[PDB]
Design a binder for this molecule. Structure first.
Ligand SMILES: COC(=O)Nc1ccc(-c2[nH]c([C@H](Cc3ccccc3)NC(=O)CCc3cc(Cl)ccc3-n3cnnn3)nc2Cl)cc1
Length: 238
C-alpha cells in the first residue's frame, strides 16, 4: 500500500495473508474471508502454482512477524479460478480457495458481506484498500497490515486513464487524480472494502494498475458485484 497507515488489530478481520511454501515460505497475496471455508482472492496470484498443497492461509494477523512455524493456518483443499480468466488486464481476475478446515468466527476473523445485486446502483464514498504490499515500486513486504482510503472512479473516467486497455464493467477503479494512495506489489487479491449503512461490503479485489499510486492511473479491481452469481455457484454447489 502506497501512502497508507498502520491498521489497528481487528480493524479488517476478513483480511488474510496467503503464503506459499515453495521454494521457501513467504507472503504471496491478500484475500478475504467470505464464508467459513472460503477465501475470495485474485486468479493471477496462482500463476505457476501447480498444487494447493503449497498454500497456507493465515487469518487474524496484524503483523507478518506473528507468523512462525508454530503459527496455526488453514490448508487449502481446492483452488477455483474463474474459467474465463486469461490475465488480470482482461478481467475475470477472481478465484476462491476452499479451506481444508472451517474458520471459527470471532473478533479477530470474520467474513465480509458480498455486495447485493440491488447495491449495483449505490454510491460508495467510504472505500479502503488494505494489504502488506510495498509502499513504492521498489520496496519490500510490510510487517504491519496497511490501509488507505481511496475514492471510487467511474468506468468512463478509468477508461480515459487506460488508453489501449478495455476497462469493462466487470472491473471497478479507484484512485486520486493526483495519485499518492493505491495498492502496490503484494497487495493483490486483497479487498477493496466499502462501508455503507454501517455495513462493510467487499466491493473489489486488488487486481492491476500501471505502476503504483501514479497520477491519473487508478488501481483496477475485480468488480465483485458482477461475480456474486459465480461465487454462489461455486460456494452453494449442491
Ligand atoms: C518475502 O515475501 C515477499 O517478498 N513476497 C512477495 C509477494 C508478492 C509480491 C508481488 N505481488 C505482485 C502482484 C502480482 C503477482 C501476484 C502473485 C505472484 C506474482 C505476481 N501485484 C500486486 O500485488 C499489485 C498489482 C497492482 C494492483 C493495483 Cl489495484 C494497483 C497497482 C498495482 N501494481 C502495479 N505494479 N505493481 N503493483 N507483484 C509482486 Cl512483485 C512481492 C513480494
Amino acid at each position: 500500500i502506497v501512502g497508507g497507515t498502520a491498521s489497528v488489530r481487528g480493524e479488517w478481520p476478513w483480511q488474510v495473508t496467503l503464503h506459499t511454501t515453495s521454494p521457501t515460505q513467504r507472503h504471496l497475496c491478500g484475500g478475504s474471508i467470505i464464508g467459513n471455508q472460503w477465501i475470495l482472492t485474485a486468479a493471477h496470484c496462482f500463476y505457476g502454482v501447480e498444487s494447493p498443497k503449497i498454500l497456507r492461509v493465515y487469518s487474524g494477523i496484524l503483523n507478518q512477524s506473528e507468523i512462525k512455524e508454530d503459527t496455526s493456518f488453514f490448508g487449502v483443499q481446492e483452488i477455483i479460478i474463474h474459467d474465463q480468466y486469461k490475465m488480470a488486464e482482461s478481467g475475470y481476475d477472481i478465484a476462491l480457495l476452499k479451506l481444508e478446515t472451517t474458520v471459527g468466527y470471532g473478533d479477530s476473523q470474520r467474513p465480509i458481506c458480498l455486495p447485493s445485486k440491488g447495491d449495483r446502483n449505490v454510491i460508495y464514498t467510504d472505500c479502503w484498500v488494505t494489504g502488506w504490499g510495498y509502499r513504492k515500486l521498489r520496496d519490500k513486504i510490510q510487517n504491519t497490515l496497511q490501509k488507505a482510503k481511496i475514492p471510487l472512479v467511474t468506468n468512463e473516467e478509468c477508461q480515459k486513464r487506460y488508453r489501449g486497455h478495455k476497462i469493462t464493467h466487470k472491473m471497478i477503479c479507484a484512485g486520486y487524480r493526483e495519485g499518492g494512495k493505491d495498492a502496490c506489489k503484494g497487495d493483490s487479491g486483497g479487498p477493496l472494502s466499502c462501508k455503507h449503512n454501517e455495513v462493510w461490503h467487499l466491493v473489489g479485489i486488488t487486481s492491476w494498475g500501471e505502476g503504483c499510486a501514479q497520477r491519473e492511473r487508478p488501481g483496477v479491481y475485480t468488480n465483485v458485484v458482477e461475480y456474486v452469481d459465480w461465487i454462489l455457484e461455486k460456494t452453494q454447489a449442491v
